[PDB]
Amino acid sequence: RIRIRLKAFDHRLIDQATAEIVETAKRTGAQVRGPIPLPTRKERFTVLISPHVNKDARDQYEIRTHLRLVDIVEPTEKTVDALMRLDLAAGVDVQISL
Amino acid sequence: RSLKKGPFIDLHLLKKVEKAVESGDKKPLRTWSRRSTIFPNMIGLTIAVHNGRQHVPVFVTDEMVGHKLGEFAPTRTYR
Amino acid sequence: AKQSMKAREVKRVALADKYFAKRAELKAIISDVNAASDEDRWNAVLKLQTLPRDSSPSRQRNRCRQTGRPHGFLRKFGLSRIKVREAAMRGEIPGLKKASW
Amino acid sequence: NQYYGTGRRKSSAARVFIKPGNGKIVINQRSLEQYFGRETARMVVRQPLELVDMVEKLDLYITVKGGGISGQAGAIRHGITRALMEYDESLRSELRKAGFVTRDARQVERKKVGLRKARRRPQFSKR
Amino acid sequence: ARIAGINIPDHKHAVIALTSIYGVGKTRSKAILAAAGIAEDVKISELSEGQIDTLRDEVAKFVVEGDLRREISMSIKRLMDLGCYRGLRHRRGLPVRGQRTKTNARTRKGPRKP
Amino acid sequence: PRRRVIGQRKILPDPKFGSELLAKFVNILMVDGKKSTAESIVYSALETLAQRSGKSELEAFEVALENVRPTVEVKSRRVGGSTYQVPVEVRPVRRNALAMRWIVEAARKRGDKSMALRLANELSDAAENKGTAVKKREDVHRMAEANKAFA
RNA sequence: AAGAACCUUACCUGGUCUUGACAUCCACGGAAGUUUUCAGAGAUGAGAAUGUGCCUUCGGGAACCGUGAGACAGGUGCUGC
RNA sequence: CCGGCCGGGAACUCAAAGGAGACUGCCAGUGAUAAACUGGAGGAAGGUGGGGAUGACGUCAAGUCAUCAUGGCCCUUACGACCAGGGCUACACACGUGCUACAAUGGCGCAUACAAAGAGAAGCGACCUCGCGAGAGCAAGCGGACCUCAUAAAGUGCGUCGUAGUCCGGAUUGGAGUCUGCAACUCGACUCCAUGAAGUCGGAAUCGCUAGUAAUCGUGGAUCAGAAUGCCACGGUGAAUAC
């Protein structure tokens, strides 16, 4: 029922964010589905490292956006509000849909 | 080739053209709008189109209708 | 970097968002294939010169926000390539590290 | 009953279920002769099936996605060789002395910056 | 096989033959044959004269060698008479559609003799 | 190279009856990397030559090749001064490959109708030793046998 | 230069502006803002209707706009020796 | 209504994490019983497995004070500032980098099958109607493993073309039309109607590549209102030679 989709940049932060947001909702709101992988979006960019000639020299950067679905099944009272006003462990865009 | 709906003209150009037409023959009208087309009602005017540094007067003709004014203002002088 | 050009560009942005995006119906709705095929659309295109040569979105060059550079611009970060590299290597842009694959 | 091999070769990915019965090959709701059996490399899947015959032992329900004709066919070959596990190394010792077990990744190299197709420099000239 | 002016074609299909006429190419030839009821696989060696007559009375609807040539000449002459940018380029022997005259534009300019 | 003493690669056997030499022949027929079409042309010419001469696909090729198989080639090996040619025996792995290369080069020209017909006619001609690949072999043997003084 | 129709533009012709288009100080007068007409290539000049709060030291304030001088601003002007 | 469409599962593909493994690990020979080389067994992978980022003290008194900061020289009623038009696209010529080809392992018409990686909200834009067409009108889904971009092409079969400057080639040209934009003459792209050129494999000279690399075929993205044969990236077929 409750579609929780969370995306961030650093995996070794988003993973534990998901762990805490899942155990703070399964210890009292159990029957959850867990951290679905939701493959990463890789936004790449290729710029020139020089302000002038020597175009052949370029730098290649990228930003990874890791996504995860929790997918809670039942809209429980131990869940609906226990999801709210608990927005710590920042750096992660979380979206809850009914 | 473009602008399927209606020719294009400037407000100043159209107003001055209608004024001079309802007035009669007048001195060459200094224009700067080469982007504008040519109406059938402007035949006879000696308007002077800007070429970049001067104004070349052109005598509007019945054939010089579908084209624009810039088609008759050679800008780049070669030799 | 030609503060004159930068002030010119911010003036363009202000005047454009002020006039267009609010009165665009004069060229988007009236110039339609409908009963407006008569002098209505002619007067519509006539008044389309009411607004100055500016005010259009195509005259927006989208220069950089730190320097004001016209070339090498990225719509994602709003900066030129030089400054985006500098900031990425200093650690200002999140998630943006050197790509290798 | 039914054994499984995965298989993958050059951006391909297969799923080869192997069952004792007829000698037919049903691949993606299409038979082997009409899938790629009309083009060249017609027996790149039947190559590892003469050292151990297939005509009247077992059939294969095959799926494959990604890559091209030869890529998917090599993926099918590797999936068959990996699914031949109910007939384990007792036969792989012979299957391997002719190939058919080397993954052979050799993926396409990434295009390099400044180059054209990862090896072709942009036509150097002195003056 | 004495259709419009030329069109003398031997051992060529109907459309590949009609492409010999200055004024009808491929799509126009296929349209001619579709309006005449002729197939695009038969040759002039097999097509009967009762159908050469249909070819005649059909291709006459479109502009032909002489009419097309004189129309083109009159358009070019009208441009050179108005003296627009296009007429100036026509008289100077240079491309009209804004092609590159610095390095390219050798066909309309002439062979690279000098 | 200079340090790498690596050897040759192990090509894939032929999808028809098992054979490596005609597989290498097919590999040297291919332009733009189109191998299916090259195999089709090779099979067409092989069938056209087998049906015309009476022999089969694998035996027919062998007779033709040996007629264009060179003996010695000349190559420049200057030794402190003059730059002269040195006729020498070529390895067999290069000899057969060069024979097939000359075959395909002669077939590239002499356009009869199609590539398969070209190559079948060239193979038939090398069978009786009156084609163009055999003419190239004889040109090489004439370059040799004349400058044999350098050894 | 990861992209010249205008724009971008740093060049030329032509018309203009000048402590100035962009930034800070003083004093004076006006809420800001909004609609609209005339002449013009437009920049611009001349206008016509509207609108008057956020707190009262309440000789007005916190913004915005019109002008005068001086400190200044501006320069893709030169010097990568 | 055989569309995984629906129940049903976490076996399988894919998917984002944490680990294992590949590290000269063992054996035979050679080598000064050392380092190391060769060969072999297991193993997907043998010896830095494949690829990338990572660029040593310094040289060229190299390029950029036009991306940006700054010493000093100068204008500072101007070399500063605003605007209409033009140019940066000009052409007797020379050069560099690529595309298109020069054709029959191929051009054309038809029926068919197999990808990866990515973009998307004052944008991508299903479906339906109109035109040969570029596109237009109504208008769902999507800030996204669902919606769109988006039909992958070479390839396979059929019929034609008989080696001709030819149906290869598409340059240039006149009218008309579609799309972005206030406006497409100078100076955009696109489809159709007519035209069809030079070009039949290229002199001296010269460049790239030793593997999935070359060669060849197609797809996406940044720039962008629109505007690439360029740049970056992805994927299909896939060689020869290294004495």
- Scanning B19-38 for CB atoms below 8 A from E yields none
Q: Which of F36, F38, F56 is nearest to F47 (CA)?
A: F56
Residues 18-57, chain C, CB closer than 7 Å to nucleic strand H: 20-21, 27, 33, 45, 48-49, 53-54, 56-57
| Domain residue ranges of chain D, discontinuous segments joined by + | 1-127
CB atoms within 10 A of CB C17: 13
Q: What is the CA radius of gyration of chain E?
A: 19
**C-alpha dist (Å) from residue E101 to E76, E85, E98, F25, F46:** 21, 15, 8, 49, 54
This structure was determined by cryo-EM
Residues 6+ apart with CB under 8 A from E47: E14, E38, E55
Give the three-class secondary structure for D86. Answer: coil
Q: Which of A16, A22, A3 is nearest to A66 (CA)?
A: A16
Walk across the sheet containing D3-5 and list its strands.
D3-5, D13-20, D58-65, D25-27, D30-31
| Contact predicate D111/D118, CB 8 Å | yes
What's the domain range around E48? 2-65
The protein residue nearest nucleotide H16, judged by CA to C1', is A37
The protein residue nearest nucleotide H95, judged by CA to C1', is D127
CB atoms within 10 A of CB A24: 14
CB atoms within 10 A of CB F118: 20
Distance, CA of F3 to CA of E112 (rounded, Å): 51
DSSP per-residue string spanning F14-61 = PSSSS-SHHHHHHHTT-STT-HHHHHHHHHHHHHHHHHHHSS-HHHHH
The protein residue nearest nucleotide G73, judged by CA to C1', is C3
Distance, CA of C79 to CA of C72 (rounded, Å): 8
| Contact predicate C46/C62, CB 8 Å | no
Distance, CA of D71 to CA of D67 (rounded, Å): 5
Q: The tokens of C6 are what?
A: 């930068």
**DSSP state letter for F91:** P
Which nucleotide is at minimal CA–C1' distance from C71? G1
Q: Which of E73, E87, C49 is nearest to B61 (CA)?
A: E87
Give residue E106's identity as a one-letter amino acid code. Answer: R
Distance, CA of D32 to CA of D42 (rounded, Å): 9
| Domain residue ranges of chain B, discontinuous segments joined by + | 1-79
Give the three-class secondary structure for C26. Answer: helix
Q: For chain A, what is the domain count? A: 1
Q: The tokens of D122 are what?
A: 């942009």
DSSP E strand boundaries for chain B:
30-31, 48-50, 55-57
User: Which DSSP helix (H) or strand (E) runs through C40?
Assistant: helix C39-47
Q: What are phi and psi of E14, to 5 degrees?
A: -65, -45
Subunits with 3+ Cβ pairs within 8 Å of A are C, D
Give residue B74's identity as a one-letter amino acid code. Answer: P
Q: Judge residue C49's burial from the number of C-beta atoms within 10 Å of its C-beta, 0-12 exposed, 13-18 middle, 19 or more buried.
A: middle
User: Which DSSP helix (H) or strand (E) runs through E104?
Assistant: none
Give the three-class secondary structure for A46. Answer: strand
For D121, the closest chain A residue by CA position comes to A56
Q: The tokens of F41 are what?
A: 């042309």
In this structure, what CATH number is given to the domain that contains residue A49?
A: 3.30.70.600
Q: Judge residue D14's burial from the number of C-beta atoms within 10 Å of its C-beta, 0-12 exposed, 13-18 middle, 19 or more buried.
A: buried
Mode of pairing for the β-strands spanning B30-31 and B48-50 = parallel
Distance, CA of E52 to CA of E45 (rounded, Å): 11
CB atoms within 10 A of CB B46: 13
**C-alpha dist (Å) from residue F13 to D71, E66, F98, F103:** 17, 65, 19, 21
Distance, CA of A84 to CA of F72 (rounded, Å): 88
Give the three-class secondary structure for C75. Answer: coil
CATH of F20-147, one of 3.40.50.720, 3.20.20.10, 1.10.455.10, 1.10.760.10: 1.10.455.10
Give the three-class secondary structure for C73. Answer: strand
Distance, CA of B4 to CA of A81 (rounded, Å): 59
The alpha carbon dihedral of F78, F80, F82, F88 has a sign of negative
**C-alpha dist (Å) from residue C10 to A14, A96, C13, C74, E62:** 39, 38, 5, 18, 58
In this structure, what CATH number is given to the domain that contains residue E16?
A: 1.10.8.50
**DSSP state letter for A58:** E
User: Which DSSP helix (H) or strand (E) runs through A69?
Assistant: strand A58-69
Q: Does B62 touch chain E (CB under 8 A)?
A: no
Give the three-class secondary structure for D65. Answer: strand
Largest CA distance in chain D: 71
Q: Which of D53, D55, D102, D60 is nearest to D80 (CA)?
A: D60
Q: Does B57 touch chain E (CB under 8 A)?
A: no
Which nucleotide is at minimal CA–C1' distance from B13? G41
| Domain residue ranges of chain F, discontinuous segments joined by + | 20-147
Residues 90-119, chain D, CB closer than 7 Å to nucleic strand H: 92-93, 96, 101-119
Distance, CA of B21 to CA of B29 (rounded, Å): 11
